[PDB]
Amino acid sequence: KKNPLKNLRIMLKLNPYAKTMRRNTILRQARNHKLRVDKAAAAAAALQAKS
Amino acid sequence: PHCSRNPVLVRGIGRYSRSAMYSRKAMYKRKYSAAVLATVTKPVGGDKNGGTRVVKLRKMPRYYPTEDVPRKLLSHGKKPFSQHVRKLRASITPGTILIILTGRHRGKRVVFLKQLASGLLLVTGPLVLNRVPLRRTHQKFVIATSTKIDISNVKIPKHLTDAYFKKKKLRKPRHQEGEIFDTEKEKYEITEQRKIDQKAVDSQILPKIKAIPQLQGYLRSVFALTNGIYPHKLVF
RNA sequence: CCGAGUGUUACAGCCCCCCCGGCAGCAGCACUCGCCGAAUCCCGGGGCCGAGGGAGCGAGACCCGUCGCCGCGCUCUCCC
RNA sequence: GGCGGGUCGCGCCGUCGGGCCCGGGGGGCCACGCGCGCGUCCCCCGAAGGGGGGGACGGCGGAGAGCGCACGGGGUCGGC
RNA sequence: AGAACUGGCGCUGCGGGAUGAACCGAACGCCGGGUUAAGGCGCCCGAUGCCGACGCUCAUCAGACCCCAGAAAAGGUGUU
RNA sequence: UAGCCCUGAAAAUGGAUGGCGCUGGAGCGUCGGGCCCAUACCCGGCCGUCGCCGGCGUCGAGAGUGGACGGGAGCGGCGGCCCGGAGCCCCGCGGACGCUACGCCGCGACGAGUAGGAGGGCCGCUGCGGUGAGCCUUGAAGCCUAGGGCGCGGGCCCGG
RNA sequence: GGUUGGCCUCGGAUAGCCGGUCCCCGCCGGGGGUCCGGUGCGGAGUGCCCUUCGUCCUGGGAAACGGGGCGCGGCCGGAA
Numbered sequence A: 001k002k003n004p005l006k007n008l009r010i011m012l013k014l015n016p017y018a019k020t021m022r023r024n025t026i027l028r029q030a031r032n033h034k035l036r037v038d039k040a041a042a043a044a045a046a047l048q049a050k051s
Numbered sequence B: 001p002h003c004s005r006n007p008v009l010v011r012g013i014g015r016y017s018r019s020a021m022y023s024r025k026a027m028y029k030r031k032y033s034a035a036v037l038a039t040v041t042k043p044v045g046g047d048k049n050g051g052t053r054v055v056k057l058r059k060m061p062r063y064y065p066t067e068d069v070p071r072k073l074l075s076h077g078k079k080p081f082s083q084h085v086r087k088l089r090a091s092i093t094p095g096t097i098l099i100i101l102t103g104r105h106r107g108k109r110v111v112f113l114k115q116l117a118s119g120l121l122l123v124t125g126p127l128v129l130n131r132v133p134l135r136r137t138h139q140k141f142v143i144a145t146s147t148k149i150d151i152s153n154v155k156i157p158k159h160l161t162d163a164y165f166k167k168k169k170l171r172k173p174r175h176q177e178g179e180i181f182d183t184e185k186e187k188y189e190i191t192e193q194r195k196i197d198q199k200a201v202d203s204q205i206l207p208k209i210k211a212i213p214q215l216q217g218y219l220r221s222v223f224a225l226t227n228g229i230y231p232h233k234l235v236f
Numbered sequence C: 001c002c003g004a005g006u007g008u009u010a011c012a013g014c015c016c017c018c019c020c021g022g023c024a025g026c027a028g029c030a031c032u033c034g035c036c037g038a039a040u041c042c043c044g045g046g047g048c049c050g051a052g053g054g055a056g057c058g059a060g061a062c063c064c065g066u067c068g069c070c071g072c073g074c075u076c077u078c079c080c
Numbered sequence D: 001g002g003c004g005g006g007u008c009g010c011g012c013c014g015u016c017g018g019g020c021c022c023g024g025g026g027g028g029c030c031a032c033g034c035g036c037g038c039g040u041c042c043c044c045c046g047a048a049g050g051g052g053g054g055g056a057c058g059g060c061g062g063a064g065a066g067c068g069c070a071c072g073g074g075g076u077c078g079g080c
Numbered sequence E: 001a002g003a004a005c006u007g008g009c010g011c012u013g014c015g016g017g018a019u020g021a022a023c024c025g026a027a028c029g030c031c032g033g034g035u036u037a038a039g040g041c042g043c044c045c046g047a048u049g050c051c052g053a054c055g056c057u058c059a060u061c062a063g064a065c066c067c068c069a070g071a072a073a074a075g076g077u078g079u080u
Numbered sequence F: 001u002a003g004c005c006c007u008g009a010a011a012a013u014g015g016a017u018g019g020c021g022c023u024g025g026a027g028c029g030u031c032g033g034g035c036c037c038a039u040a041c042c043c044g045g046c047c048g049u050c051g052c053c054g055g056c057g058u059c060g061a062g063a064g065u066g067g068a069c070g071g072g073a074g075c076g077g078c079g080g081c082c083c084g085g086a087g088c089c090c091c092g093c094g095g096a097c098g099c100u101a102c103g104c105c106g107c108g109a110c111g112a113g114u115a116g117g118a119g120g121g122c123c124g125c126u127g128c129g130g131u132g133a134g135c136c137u138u139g140a141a142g143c144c145u146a147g148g149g150c151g152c153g154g155g156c157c158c159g160g
Numbered sequence G: 001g002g003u004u005g006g007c008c009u010c011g012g013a014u015a016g017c018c019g020g021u022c023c024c025c026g027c028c029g030g031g032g033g034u035c036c037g038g039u040g041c042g043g044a045g046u047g048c049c050c051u052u053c054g055u056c057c058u059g060g061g062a063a064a065c066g067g068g069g070c071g072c073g074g075c076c077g078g079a080a
């Protein structure tokens, strides 16, 4: 018995939806890593250009 | 013979879905339905003997062994040695100064060039400083030292590979006679060729070593832990 | 006269406390709020110990099952 | 003159709920024979009681040939 | 000395209680890894060799972990 | 009034926080993070017992969870000059192991034990009926053994 | 069995060490100004050999002791 949640495609033998549950939650914590660091620099470059 | 058209983001996961790979592959217009020799005869070549001979070779074997093992269960490919993967560490770039540990040299600081097609990263201290030829070393028995040399564009020859750094022995005799196997009184004479080809690469590292001043004494020196030197208070 | 250290009383003439009307952009954040947490959650590493145990429904296989399930990409149309 | 109890409508609430709908004016989706008629619903049209499109169907009107790989895949091998 | 309920030793190791039938954990094929229980972490003795936190207490008989192996009435400007 | 320490407070070999010791704690009281181990728990291996089984399909010709033929109507897919059709294998004569059925083979769970009861024993000693075309002076029984093994063990075998 | 050795203040901790005039013990060491340093840098979390591959060929900086030793012999120093 290989452990689910430690190798993939044992999750997908038993819960086939849990691959597309995962590449929704690797996009949306990459595009919201984009959304922060772009905006966290946007108040950091605006404060920089004042000086 | 096309590209991936579904580029990876996590190992074994495509970025594009199952239905979005029903648009990108253009599968909505290529759905389809469309629909010996053992040998030959060989001539006789004889008298009173026609009707050339049988389609027959590689016959039933001359001897079966008395006991037979059962064949394996396969399970998975668990692929062989020459087909795994090559993994550097994060702290080793071409030009990162090393420390040899497991070898005969044991602390001779050397200059890393390239990580080969085998796994063993190729290295040389320049022979005018160390006593290191183009010997291979294992990846995890060296220590990356955080100073670097600039060999970003130097050269590396096409010819040298795993078949260039190996060893040779072959059994011609099979008799317990007082020679040492017939080649083991013998220092190896393959140095006829590497003497030329080291200066094919040693004549271009020395303009890159001697830019920074103290460096040629740093390679000529060796390494030691004596008194207050502990290797968890040492940023290698 | 300057500075200090006591002591006297006094409410902006250091400041604090509480109301009455607000912006900036707010992160459980400049390691104090460390809260309680995951369908509202996942990635990458190193470290240790082990590696026990004739699957071909097909071609009448053929030297020797790189096989079943599961997720796959590629060709059986083209263009760039 | 006041409460609690059963209920009617009223706006005001929530990332409400029904995939809802309904008509018009980037992201996601295990979501695929144009050729026509088999049942529902909608859009319209001049009608006034039928033509024509859309959508979809748990049903018919249309609607097999397997090719080679890579694999976190039925308890490790090395063609180190 | 005699009982009631239930557990336990007898028949039973092991960890802990310095030592022990019966306490506290916990029940046993032979083993390799990991983790905890009761307990402990100056050194015998594995582990606090934490910059552990807050207060109390000085004995000319200090005090120091269930069963458990030494104590009361009464008293003190000894100290909070 | 109540926390600590003191007085109260005496016992016979020399003596007990277990001891050495301990006083910005190694004491008392309330607490935190770490960290150490049982034959406890979890994963993995191996042995055995128990529970429900699996094969006499060696059927390389076997494959069935619907099977046959079979004539009266039409689908594609076969082979054209739009009508329509058996091939018992064969160019290889071929395809491991196994089912002591009282034997294998698979999964799964548990394992302590006196008194006591069973089952098993290819453990042993002495004799008898059978059986080994057994064994031996070219050396049996016995005994010894720093010799080599096996069995979990009762014990056994080989060398000297 | 080991893998370089440290060749030495006294003590203080509500305090301490450095360098330094005046007037004292046979030309040094003793008492006071004053000046530094101080979470110890005149700092055993420090220090010195050093991690010394060897050698040649050759040039710049440092150098007037040469330094091992069978030395040759002399000298006093240090008894807990």
Ligand SMILES: [Mg+2]
Pocket (backbone or CB within 6 Å): none
């Ligand atoms: Mg008995």
